[PDB]
Ligand binder design. Sequence first.
Ligand SMILES: CSc1ccncc1NS(=O)(=O)N1CCC[C@H](C(N)=O)C1
Ligand SMILES: [Zn+2]
Length: 140
Amino acid sequence: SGAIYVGNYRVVNRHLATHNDWANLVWEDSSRDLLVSSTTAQGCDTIARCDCQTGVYYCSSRRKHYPVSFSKPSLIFVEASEYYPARYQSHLMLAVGHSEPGDCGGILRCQHGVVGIVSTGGNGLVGFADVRDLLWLDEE
Ligand SMILES: CSc1ccncc1NS(=O)(=O)N1CCC[C@H](C(N)=O)C1
Ligand SMILES: [Zn+2]
């Protein structure tokens, strides 16, 4: 579990969105595993606007933040899970690191701010849904 709180927005994995998230929906995209809802209080996270390929992510299954090297956002095949059928997920970055299903939502960050959230994994890999292209998270 986990979310990004920037401005009056809450960014979560689409597959983990609550009924309150859907009832206050701003934008969702199943191909990216992302959903954004509106919030009453202002959040403290800042979004990175950069092309870093190194950063640090939070792994809840280890209670630890790990430094990682990650690939550029791409279209990657993701196997069938209890949340989606086998499909191509877009804007996904891969890294070598520990992950378990419940680790989804952990933040990946660089020196500039939040880069994305854990979305996929398995066998010593972890995948992150990038958010750096969503410029509208910084306004309105
Ligand atoms: C951190 S997710 C994870 C980690 C380790 N083993 C396995 C997994 N699970 S998964 O990769 O099948 N995942 C399950 C939840 C939905 C995800 C999606 N974005 O399509 C796919
Ligand atoms: Zn950066």
